[PDB]
Amino acid sequence: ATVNQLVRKPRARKVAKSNVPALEACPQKRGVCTRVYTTTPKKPNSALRKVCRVRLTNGFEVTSYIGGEGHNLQEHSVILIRGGRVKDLPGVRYHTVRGALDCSGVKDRKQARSKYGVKRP
Amino acid sequence: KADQDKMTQALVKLQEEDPTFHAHTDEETGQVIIGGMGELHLDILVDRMKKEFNVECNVGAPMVSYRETFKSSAQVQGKFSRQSGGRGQYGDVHIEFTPNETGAGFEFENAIVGGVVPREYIPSVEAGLKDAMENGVLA
Amino acid sequence: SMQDPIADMLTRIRNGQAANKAAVTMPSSKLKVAIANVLKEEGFIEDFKVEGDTKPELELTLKYFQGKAVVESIQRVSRPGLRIYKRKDELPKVMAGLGIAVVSTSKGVMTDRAARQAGLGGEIICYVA
RNA sequence: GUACACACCGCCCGUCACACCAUGGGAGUGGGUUGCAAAAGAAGUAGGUAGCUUAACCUUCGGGAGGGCGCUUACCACUUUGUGAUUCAUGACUGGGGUGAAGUCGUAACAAGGUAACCGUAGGGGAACCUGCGGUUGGAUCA
RNA sequence: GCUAGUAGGUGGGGUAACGGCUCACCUAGGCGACGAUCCCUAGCUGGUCUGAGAGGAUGACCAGCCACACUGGAACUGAGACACGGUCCAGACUCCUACGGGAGGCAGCAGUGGGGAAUAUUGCACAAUGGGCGCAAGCCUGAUGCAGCCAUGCCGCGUGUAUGAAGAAGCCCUUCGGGUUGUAAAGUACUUUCAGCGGGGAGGAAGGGAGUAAAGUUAAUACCUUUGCUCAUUGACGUUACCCGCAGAAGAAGCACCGGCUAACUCCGUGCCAGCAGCCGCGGUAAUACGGAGGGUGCAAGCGUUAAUCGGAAUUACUGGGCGUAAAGCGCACGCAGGCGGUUUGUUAAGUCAGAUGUGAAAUCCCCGGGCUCAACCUGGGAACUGCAUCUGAUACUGGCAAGCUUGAGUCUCGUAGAGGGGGGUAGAAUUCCAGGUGUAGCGGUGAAAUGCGUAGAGAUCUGGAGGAAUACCGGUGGCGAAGGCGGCCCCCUGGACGAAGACUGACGCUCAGGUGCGAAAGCGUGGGGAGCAAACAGGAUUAGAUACCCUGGUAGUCCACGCCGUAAACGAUGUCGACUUGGAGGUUGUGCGCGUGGCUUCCGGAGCUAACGCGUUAAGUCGACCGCCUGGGGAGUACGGCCGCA
RNA sequence: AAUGG
Ligand SMILES: [K+]
Ligand SMILES: [K+]
Ligand SMILES: [K+]
Ligand SMILES: [K+]
Ligand SMILES: [K+]
Ligand SMILES: [K+]
Ligand SMILES: [K+]
Ligand SMILES: [K+]
Ligand SMILES: [K+]
Ligand SMILES: [K+]
Ligand SMILES: [K+]
Ligand SMILES: [Mg+2]
Ligand SMILES: [Mg+2]
Ligand SMILES: [Mg+2]
Ligand SMILES: [Mg+2]
Ligand SMILES: [Mg+2]
Ligand SMILES: [Mg+2]
Ligand SMILES: [Mg+2]
Ligand SMILES: [Mg+2]
Ligand SMILES: [Mg+2]
Ligand SMILES: [Mg+2]
Ligand SMILES: [Mg+2]
Ligand SMILES: [Mg+2]
Ligand SMILES: [Mg+2]
Ligand SMILES: [Mg+2]
Ligand SMILES: [Mg+2]
Ligand SMILES: [Mg+2]
Ligand SMILES: [Mg+2]
Ligand SMILES: [Mg+2]
Ligand SMILES: [Mg+2]
Ligand SMILES: [Mg+2]
Ligand SMILES: [Mg+2]
Ligand SMILES: [Mg+2]
Ligand SMILES: [Mg+2]
């Protein structure tokens, strides 16, 4: 680009879109579970990972991963979601915060308890 | 459906105000069931939701989850074969479905003799049955 | 078409040094002769000579050291497309002083060193190191 | 030569089936903003003055001056009407796209890939594609 | 494209004042590609965050400025308002009522409901600072000073110190020997911050009073004022900061992580499950990756996670990037605006440069110092604020102006080569067809066949005729053209290029958004033409199938005139112009004297360049001018909108 | 110069 060309049209930056649009620049967001189900990961991984469609207070419905082993989440449950995609689950871009609101902590957890909402044993 | 959101909030508040008022969702039927100390009680609660909470709701008899069972004992063979397109898949199993004592539950028996069915495939056989039994065989 | 004769001179010098040419010739001009004088006094060129009246021709005799061109670099700074004028405080230091920068000042075409002493800035013609 | 490297028992394309996501079109349906053409005219201010009334000044003591009220006009807010523009939401149904199984149908490309491939265009066909016309080498082969 | 009080003028009115501010009249202006108008978004700044910097992001708290006060209007009063806690009108909404009528505006401080992931007490004092009123005393002050809550941040500190080895127990590992946990423990000495208890006790307090004396004051020594002097008092915080004593180690450690990136590894579960996961990836018989345990590592009253900004990212490259094959040269050209421009003299000084002066709030940042026990924090001074004005100079370059000059560019004179273009005419070969003759059973086709053709005489051969399309050989890394393209021969009209030797003009140039023109094939419209060929279509084969490839047929089209379409791997995948930089071997077309000197072109190759391949005086080398264009793969050159088209 | 491997 010549200076004259740049005079006519300046250098343009990038949009830099977010990977967590539903949060709307918020650390966490409350929501209600519309369907708690399981899905299979894409190749090469293999399992039955647990997910839940959740309608946010902002009015966005998004699939959020329920981390840990076992969950007390049923339909019509008030949960707090946060940012964090699941690489092998296409579409899942959010993670439920265990131990906040209805969502209970992972039972029988002795490591990384803070990340699974488990009080000090 | 718009009221459903408001209904949730309404139930929470009502439950806090009145101890004897209870609300829960039956997982099987996927139905929120309200509990009270009488017809008059629940009537008042419902009307309060309709006005104060502005949630138009309709009450009714709680749906009942039914189960099924086999009345007769029979031996049946199940066979699969798919060689139509490229890779071929085959499997055959001879199973006897006998009525179990009520309450005992599913009791899969591996009576395979001479390894006619490979040991590795036997767990899958049970898994297949369990999944099929989870689904209705009648209604 | 030709729109920068100074850069043409600088290019001929650089191309000459690479081709190990004894001397380069070009159409003469007051500014070219001015710059030639600067290079000669700094010992970047051996000597220069202008011949002709109707069409004066400037011949620059190039100097090589240990079989290596004395001029290692000669880059035009201010160009027709982008003129560059620096103040005396903003004067550049080519190769941390080891190289020279030809600056056109009101008092005349001179090195960055000369201009800095005289307390005069101006158009930075080129950097010769 | 090559798009192969558990190395041609390689790699690899599209339809159809199923699931899911985002999205275009869509009789329309509900909002926001706004243009133009009008209508309207509270309060206030200014102007004028049918009438009505009046502390300070003047006066022949009657009045006069001046003021107020009232009325009227101009400006103008709400509001109203018609007709456009724009934007947002939503819509029976419909088009293509993306992702996912280990479904089905073929094998189009990669070797000359078994009809070299590809580009523009036209016609045709379940699909990958096929055929014509011109162009390109980003084809191999020559003993 | 926009504008009609619009743009300007004249006069009057109006304002504190200038002014289309307003009005009458006159003129037809004004604005806009240096982006008007319209649409979307938003308080601005000092500053904050990030960055080496240039920048990027951002504008809570602090300070300056602006705007706003239920919503939409409007004045009034006043020095000042079109006024948070004023008025009037209208509206929305709420409230009180005796139902006859009234009332209200937390975007002041608390506080409530609601919304949300989420943000605190309906606190104390006017002691201090500051403000209103007043003669003063004083009064008012949710300003302000303090207190409350919150790990929300920054900073400081404590949770002990020393000793303590068979180093116990236990745990864990184990090579079943030991080892590790680990001086860690226990034990033995020992000090108590901080906490708690009790005791003592700064500074923020200056003033204002009562007066008492002096001076002034004037008639007065009155009064009052001023300055000394005396005396009693003036704190919310506050049970203050801080100091002393008290006894006791008491009352004080958590969180994440250990496959690599990246500091920290084993055992045992689980067995592509259950799980993990920033990225790469792990998990199907032990998995330092999951689950749990031991041990280790990093941080610490915090530790993680999520969100967010900048950096790293030279990944929008001004600093500081690219376009032969990776994304990227418009199909080609002309040309306006624009950008840039050869050499000389004078002149100006616009840019540029120098100096002076004014300004650039404070705070903040930085530096050097102080005060807080230290730090955080507070404070003195300086530097800085990179800028913007103005005045006086310099004038090299750039710009302007004037006069120039050939070297760029162009004109004229002469000659040469060419499938350059447009129009018309004509020749030969061949195919097909038509008519006739001769002649007899095959012909034709394929990998092999078949369909098809033929005794209703084919095919072959000969003669005559018809019509359309294309031009063998020459012919070529030949030539010509901006590109697309252009090939029998002849005539007519016309473009460009190149060479030789002069003359002439005098920078007249280069590039070019927009714009305009040209632009293979296919296609489209109208009217012709139609031999051959051939999309579609039909039949025969092939094949598992064969909407194909092959065979037999065959229509549009291919041709012409005129109009439209505007695209191709329209490719050298290489924009145009100019200058410069080793060689060798060829093709083609001039010119001079076997040797030269021009134009164009092919191959090879040096330096250099390149990721490599390669390119290499016809650059992809070295530079300058200008234009176009790119910023992961898909989605997609698609959707929508506009423009164009008969489609 | 069959076709599929
Ligand atoms: K759809
Ligand atoms: K093909
Ligand atoms: K084609
Ligand atoms: K006006
Ligand atoms: K307002
Ligand atoms: K650059
Ligand atoms: K021009
Ligand atoms: K000058
Ligand atoms: K035909
Ligand atoms: K261009
Ligand atoms: K993308
Ligand atoms: Mg729609
Ligand atoms: Mg009125
Ligand atoms: Mg193929
Ligand atoms: Mg092929
Ligand atoms: Mg090919
Ligand atoms: Mg076909
Ligand atoms: Mg071509
Ligand atoms: Mg705003
Ligand atoms: Mg950058
Ligand atoms: Mg790059
Ligand atoms: Mg490319
Ligand atoms: Mg090109
Ligand atoms: Mg100047
Ligand atoms: Mg000049
Ligand atoms: Mg000619
Ligand atoms: Mg054509
Ligand atoms: Mg055919
Ligand atoms: Mg044919
Ligand atoms: Mg194109
Ligand atoms: Mg191209
Ligand atoms: Mg041009
Ligand atoms: Mg080469
Ligand atoms: Mg398109």
Curated annotation (Swiss-Prot), chain A:
Location of 3-methylthioaspartic acid modifications: D88
Source species, domain of life: Bacteria
CDD domains per the UniProt record, alphabetical: Ribosomal_S12 (cd03368)
One GO molecular-function entry: misfolded RNA binding
Residues bearing the modification N6-acetyllysine: K107
SUPFAM superfamilies referenced in this protein's UniProt entry, alphabetically: Nucleic acid-binding proteins
Gene3D superfamilies named among the record's database cross-references: Nucleic acid-binding proteins
Cellular compartments per GO CC: cytoplasm; cytosol; cytosolic small ribosomal subunit; ribosome
Outcome of substituting K42R: Confers streptomycin resistance but not hyperaccurate translation
PROSITE patterns the record matches: RIBOSOMAL_S12
One biological process term in Gene Ontology: positive regulation of RNA splicing
Keywords: Acetylation, Antibiotic resistance, Methylation, Ribonucleoprotein, Ribosomal protein, RNA-binding, rRNA-binding, tRNA-binding
InterPro entries referenced in this protein's UniProt entry, alphabetically: NA-bd_OB-fold, Ribosomal_uS12, Ribosomal_uS12_bac
Similarity section: Belongs to the universal ribosomal protein uS12 family.
Function according to Swiss-Prot or TrEMBL: With S4 and S5 plays an important role in translational accuracy.
Subunit: Part of the 30S ribosomal subunit. Contacts proteins S8 and S17. Interacts with ArfA. May interact with IF1 in the 30S initiation complex.
Protein name: Small ribosomal subunit protein uS12
Source organism: Escherichia coli (strain K12)
UniProt lineage: Bacteria, Pseudomonadati, Pseudomonadota, Gammaproteobacteria, Enterobacterales
Curated annotation (Swiss-Prot), chain B:
Alphabetized UniProt keyword annotations: Cytoplasm, Elongation factor, GTP-binding, Nucleotide-binding, Protein biosynthesis
GO cellular component: cytoplasm
GO MF entry, a single one: GTP binding
Main location, first listed in the record: cytoplasm
Subcellular location as annotated: Cytoplasm
Coiled coil: none
Chain's role: Catalyzes the GTP-dependent ribosomal translocation step during translation elongation. During this step, the ribosome changes from the pre-translocational (PRE) to the post-translocational (POST) state as the newly formed A-site-bound peptidyl-tRNA and P-site-bound deacylated tRNA move to the P and E sites, respectively. Catalyzes the coordinated movement of the two tRNA molecules, the mRNA and conformational changes in the ribosome.
Family statement drawn from the similarity comment of this UniProt entry: Belongs to the TRAFAC class translation factor GTPase superfamily. Classic translation factor GTPase family. EF-G/EF-2 subfamily.
Protein's name according to its UniProt entry: Elongation factor G
Native species: Staphylococcus aureus (strain NCTC 8325 / PS 47)
Name of the gene encoding the protein in the UniProt record: fusA
Swiss-Prot record, chain C:
Any one GO biological process: ribosomal small subunit assembly
One of the Pfam families matching this protein, by short name: Ribosomal_S8
Record-annotated membrane-spanning stretches: none
Swiss-Prot/TrEMBL keywords: Repressor, Ribonucleoprotein, Ribosomal protein, RNA-binding, rRNA-binding, Translation regulation
One GO CC term, this protein: cytosol
GO molecular-function term, one example from the UniProt record: rRNA binding
HAMAP family: Ribosomal_uS8_B
Annotated protein name in UniProt: Small ribosomal subunit protein uS8
Organism: Escherichia coli (strain K12)
Biological classification of the source: Bacteria, Pseudomonadati, Pseudomonadota, Gammaproteobacteria, Enterobacterales
This protein's encoding gene: rpsH
